Chain A
Amino acid sequence: MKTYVPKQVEPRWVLIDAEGKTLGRLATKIATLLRGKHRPDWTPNVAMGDFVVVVNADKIRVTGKKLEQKIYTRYSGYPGGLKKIPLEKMLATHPERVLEHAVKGMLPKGPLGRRLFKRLKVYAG
C-alpha cells in the first residue's frame, strides 16, 4: 500500500494582523503555515503551503529589554565589515525585515526553504 501524495493543489492565501502579537510566538505560526504542516497532505519536497500576507508589522511587540539590547549583525566581505543594528533602529528604519528575519530563520534551509520565504509578503500598516 503506497502512501498518498497529492497532485498540484491550488495555493491558499492568508492574512494576519500582527499588532500586539509578540514576535517569535507569531513567527512559529507563519512558519508551519508557509511549510504547510497544518494540511493533512503535507509533503516535504513540494511546497504546498499557504501564501501568507501580514499587515501591521512595525506593531509587533516584544518582551524584556530587547528593543535597546537585541542587535542584528551583517558582515560584508571586508575588514571591519561587521555591522551591528539594534532592534529599535531597525523598526525605525525598516520595520518588517524584523518579522521577515524572524521567519526566514525559522524556515528550512535549501532551495525549497528559500522558495517558501518568497511566499510571505510583509507590510507595515
Chain B
Amino acid sequence: KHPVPKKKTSKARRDARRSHHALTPPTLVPCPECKAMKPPHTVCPECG
C-alpha cells in the first residue's frame, strides 16, 4: 500500500505539466448605453 513518487520530478517535467495552466482573459463586450466594458448577456455594472 501507500504509493509514493519514485523520483523527484525535474523542473522541465513539472513546467511541461503546466503548459495548460494559463488563464484566458475574460471575454468582454462594449456596453450599448454606457461607455464601459461588460461581459455579454449580463447586466451592465454602470447603467443597469
User: Do any beta carbons of A and B sit within 8 angstroms of each other in the complex?
Assistant: no
Residue numbers of B with Cβ under 8 A of A are none
Residue numbers of A with Cβ under 8 A of B are none
